[PDB]
Amino acid sequence: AKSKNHTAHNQTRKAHRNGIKKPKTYKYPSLKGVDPKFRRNHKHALHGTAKALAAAKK
Amino acid sequence: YAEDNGIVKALRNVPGVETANVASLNLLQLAPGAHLGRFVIWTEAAFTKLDQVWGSETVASSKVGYTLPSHIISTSDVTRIINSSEIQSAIRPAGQATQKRTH
């Protein structure tokens, strides 16, 4: 009572029915995984430059 | 009618004629077969009490919480709006209704 164990025939043809999807990179990719020391610094650097470009500009 | 003085018993025999109070105004009588428009014979007391029942800008409601509905267009005629003055000065001129068959 054996049967077919595996194939990959009609697997590269199903995928190309819908056209292998490019991963949609963005401007400002997510900082999840960036080193936490640099991440804390860049948090406070953006925090500083928002103060500098909000308070000084009137 | 608005005040019954032997009117339902008077006209309950004649075929077709149905009577209805103002405060009732059944929908199953006014639009039979979901088709609009029944030839309704009002009485004068019924006409004024209809003004009291459904309300207007002056009288308020007499149905708690109810206001007569708002339109979403100001005039049911559209060609009147399309014509009048202001649109046609903003409109590019017209092509022919059926086009020439070139080639």
Binding site: - | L28, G33, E44, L50, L68
Partner: protein, 52 residues
């Protein structure tokens, strides 16, 4: 400026009295809400039928 509906007597003879429209006759004439609500309301005097 309501269009001043006149009142008829019992013997015809349209009387000089006049009445304004009660502003129900300027409501939105909606055939579709009347249609669907008429179907849902007309199903409300049905009795139960069933087999044993």
């Amino acid at each position: 400026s309501r269009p001043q509906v006149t009142v008829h007597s019992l013997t015809g003879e349209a009387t000089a009295n006049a009445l304004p429209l009660p502003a129900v006759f300027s409501a939105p004439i909606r055939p579709d809400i009347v249609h669907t609500v008429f179907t849902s309301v007309n199903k409300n005097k049905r009795q139960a039928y069933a087999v044993s």
